[PDB]
């Protein structure tokens, strides 16, 4: 027949999977004027995107929510955003001093205010002091009568965070650089892995508020009007149960103690702060959930927990194991840290709740062992309403307990749709044509 | 090289015979001497505030050069200076008459006349001509 | 307070379409390939260093500045058992670049040194008359 010759094409719409660098592209309003928002790092890239979207309608791309790289690039960056911000603030090495702590006039908690001699920046004469110290940060030392010492002296350094900054979790949109198209599944029956039907293409991902909480997920993002629950093997016992429920469950948590301002001794140009006085009467902080909807919720969960084996033996159980930082429910609220007891939330089922919250001050970094941030609060009481669009469970009559040791799994619940592919725009094909040759 | 920024469009094409006043030639006679290797005769001696800024300066010299070659490269107008196309001008873009655009007008005012409409013209060259002619050329090689 | 539907095309919009429908779409994937705390800068060079390579390979093949072009290199039916009209009317590109992935290195050597190297020694020596 005819002779065929190769023919070069450019801009051919193909891709392979690649692992490249994405970049922050945040909000850009009210970042100026004292907003040292540590998530924004003063509005990281000021884009405020217009997230357009192109449907492709003939494309099947075999996704995977479990071998995704985008969740790995967050957990690199978030502690990396801490580390530059943890640097210039005040170091707290010279404070690990033996104490004399007595009972405070209006349980185990704030009973002990303390006193110790220190000579930080004057470097001439020591001076005793008065502070306010909770539990969960002190140790009654040996061979002495009522003498305390901070729990994390002989770890790495105990640098605090500065009061200019704010940990306010504004939504961050991950955009893609040139030559990379972030894709997104358009099927809401997407169970986590496998193929999709009519994958689209966005410039930039949707709202991701990088909140930090164990055992739940607060200001999250929720699917349509079925409850979807995904996991890795979903038969294996030591995996993580990602729960996406179709409605929100409203939460109130408050700190009724009128904590105030304060003046503690100065480092070298470094004023250090330790929580000033309460107004004179102590009410212990608590979360406060509308317990009807929560009771309504968990029977709705075993509707969709069930349909992978039989029609029998569903229960709910509370957590277990170790010190209360991994036991009790952890989350932040506006420059303040909460460890709340959540044993009441996990009664079993069949086919207004007040929770005792606990607050500490010396708080470990989230995954590294070693350094640890620190922040005394601002004046007044604290209130933050919130939401719930998910929780983290484990397998163990088939026992479900609230597990959790990685908020990447929270970010896996946020990024269960996305995939970044590089363009290989050059391509060739044969036809009958031929270059003119003389 | 901006010597005729107050001249008119019907007259600035006269002096544009010089290579846009040797536009790109000023870059190569710069980067021959921007690439004075005294930077390598020091290894900058450190990382300094200027070398951070020079690094962010050379990138924009790289990128914004490419965005002007690529758009000339895709338009079937690679490397030329005055090329015609096959796209018909639509009077909805500008209802100015002929001589007013050329004889009686600056350049930068004419930018603000069609800075709205500019992006539509970009697509209406490629998908109308340079995407299009390549298929019709390849049909004329099928025989 | 804005919004209208699609007019021309989207980015990667033809990537589920056939070849005969995607061949009129190449410019949108051609424009946005280049434009789009050090770790932005390390991206801003890789995006350049990938663009030059694809630009360079078109340059060697006598096919720089054109979006499409033809050569005189013969297609070898050992590379594809696919029929002709199945390719231009049924197969998408994303599938197509899994099928000729192995042969790609043979192709690129058999463009330059085959023809466009040879179309210069033949070209230079068509003088003297």
């Amino acid at each position, epitope marked *: 027949a005819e002779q065929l010759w190769v023919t070069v094409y450019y801009g051919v719409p193909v891709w392979k999977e690649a692992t490249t660098t994405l970049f922050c592209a945040s909000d850009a309003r009210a970042y100026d004027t004292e907003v040292h928002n540590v998530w924004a790092t003063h509005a990281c890239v000021p884009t405020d995107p*217009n997230p357009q*979207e192109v449907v492709l309608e003939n494309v099947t791309e075999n996704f995977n929510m479990w071998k995704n790289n985008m969740v790995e690039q967050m957990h690199e960056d978030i502690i990396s955003l801490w580390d530059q911000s943890l640097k210039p603030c005040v170091k707290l090495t010279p404070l690990c001093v033996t104490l004399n702590c007595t009972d405070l006039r209006n349980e185990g908690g704030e009973i002990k205010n303390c006193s110790f001699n220190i000579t930080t920046s004057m470097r001439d004469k020591v001076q005793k002091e008065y502070a306010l110290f909770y539990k969960l940060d002190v140790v009654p030392i040996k061979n002495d009568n009522t003498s305390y010492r901070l729990i994390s002296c002989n770890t790495s350094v105990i640098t605090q965070a500065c009061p200019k900054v704010s940990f306010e979790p504004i939504p961050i949109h991950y955009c893609a650089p040139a030559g990379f198209a972030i894709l997104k599944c358009n099927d809401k029956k997407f169970n986590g892995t496998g193929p999709c039907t009519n994958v689209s293409t966005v410039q930039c991902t949707h709202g991701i508020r990088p909140v930090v909480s164990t055992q739940l997920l607060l200001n999250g993002s929720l699917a349509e009007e079925e409850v979807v629950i995904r996991s890795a093997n979903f038969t294996d016992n030591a995996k993580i149960i990602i729960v996406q429920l179709n409605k929100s469950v409203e939460i109130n948590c408050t700190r009724p103690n009128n904590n105030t301002r304060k003046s503690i001794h100065i480092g070298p140009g470094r004023a250090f702060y330790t929580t000033g006085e309460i107004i004179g009467d102590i009410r212990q902080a608590h979360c406060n959930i509308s317990g009807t909807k929560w009771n309504d919720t968990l029977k709705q969960i075993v509707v969709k927990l069930k349909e992978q084996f039989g029609n029998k033996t569903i229960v709910f159980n509370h957590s277990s194991g170790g010190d209360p930082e991994i036991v009790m429910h952890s989350f932040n609220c506006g420059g303040e840290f909460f460890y709340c007891n959540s044993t009441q939330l996990f009664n079993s089922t069949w086919n207004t709740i007040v929770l005792p919250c606990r607050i500490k001050q010396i708080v470990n970094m989230w995954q590294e062992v070693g350094k640890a941030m620190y922040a005394p609060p601002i004046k007044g009481q604290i209130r933050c309403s919130s939401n719930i669009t998910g929780l983290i469970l484990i397998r163990d009559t088939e026992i479900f307990r609230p597990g959790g040791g990685d908020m990447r799994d929270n970010w896996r619940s946020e990024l269960y749709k996305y995939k970044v592919v590089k363009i290989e725009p050059l391509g060739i094909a044969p036809t009958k044509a031929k270059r003119r040759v003389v | 090289f901006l010597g005729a920024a107050g001249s008119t469009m019907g007259a600035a094409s006269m002096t544009l015979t010089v290579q846009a006043r040797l536009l790109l030639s000023g870059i190569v006679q710069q980067q021959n001497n921007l690439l004075r290797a005294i930077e390598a005769q020091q290894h900058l001696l450190q990382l300094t505030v200027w070398g951070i800024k020079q690094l962010q300066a050379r990138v924009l010299a790289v990128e914004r050069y490419l965005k002007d070659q690529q758009l000339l490269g895709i338009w079937g107008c690679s490397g030329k200076l005055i090329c015609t196309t096959a796209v018909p001008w639509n009077t909805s873009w500008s209802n100015k008459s002929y001589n007013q655009i050329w004889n009686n007008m600056t350049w930068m005012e004419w930018e603000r006349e069609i800075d709205n409409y500019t992006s539509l013209i970009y697509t209406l060259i490629e998908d109308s001509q340079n995407q299009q002619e390549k298929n019709e050329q390849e049909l004329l090689e099928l025989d | 307070a*804005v919004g209208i539907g699609a007019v021309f095309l989207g*980015f990667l919009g033809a990537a589920g379409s056939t070849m005969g429908a995607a061949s009129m779409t190449l410019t949108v994937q051609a424009r946005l390939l280049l434009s789009g705390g050090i770790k932005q800068l390390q991206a801003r060079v890789l995006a350049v260093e990938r663009y030059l390579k694809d630009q360079q390979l078109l340059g060697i093949w006598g096919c720089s500045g054109k979006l499409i072009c033809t050569t005189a290199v013969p297609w070898n039916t050992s590379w594809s058992n696919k029929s002709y009209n199945q390719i231009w009317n049924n197969m998408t590109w994303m599938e197509w670049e899994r099928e000729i992935d192995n042969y790609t290195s043979l192709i690129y050597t058999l463009i330059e040194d085959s023809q466009n190297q040879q179309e210069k020694n033949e070209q230079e020596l068509l003088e003297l008359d």
Partner: antibody
Amino acid sequence: VQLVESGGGVVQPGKSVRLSCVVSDFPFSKYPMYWVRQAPGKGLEWVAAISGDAWHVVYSNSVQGRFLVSRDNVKNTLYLEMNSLKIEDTAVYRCARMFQESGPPRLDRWSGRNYYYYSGMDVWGQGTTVTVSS
Amino acid sequence: IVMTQTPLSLSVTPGQPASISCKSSESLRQSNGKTSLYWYRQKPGQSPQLLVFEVSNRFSGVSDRFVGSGSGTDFTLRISRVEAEDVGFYYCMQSKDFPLTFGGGTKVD
């Protein structure tokens, strides 16, 4: 400038009229328009909107599909035609101009889709009134 | 979206400052860099007239004592030394997206 309407009055259910707002002096093809409905003793309800080139039309959900709007940039007119009339449509209609100027449509590069910008109003016509009853 | 306001009735006399706020459910900040909330006034029996277009700027024929401010959700219009002819209603009008709604219109006597 001068901004009034015409064709108002009173009709029955199931009927169909068309008003006529006429502008005076500004370049009419440059600007988009609107329609608003103040019920007697109530607040205001937005009705409709046209682009400047008469290409983009956005209706309220309640009057969706029933009404009709159009432009004539040469005759500098503005029409609100209506169909399938109900008694609760009895209110004051007002013709109204956008405050700002609008541009041509935008055509974002990344997806071949134009964009018509829409902002609010400054010049309300005094407007006619249509009553639907027996 | 939903956007109501408060208080409905402020039957006052001239000589004092006060303010009228309009409360937003959806936050307003368009990607142009501005918050499309338009405050204006009708008189009884009249088609309305523009008081201020943006929450920052004003309109022609407007006394200087008409000041407005607000966040993306909080929105406030303040009238210093409330003038004798401040009768009728005061509608808060937003321009985020469609259908763009109103407030009830605060009556001031």
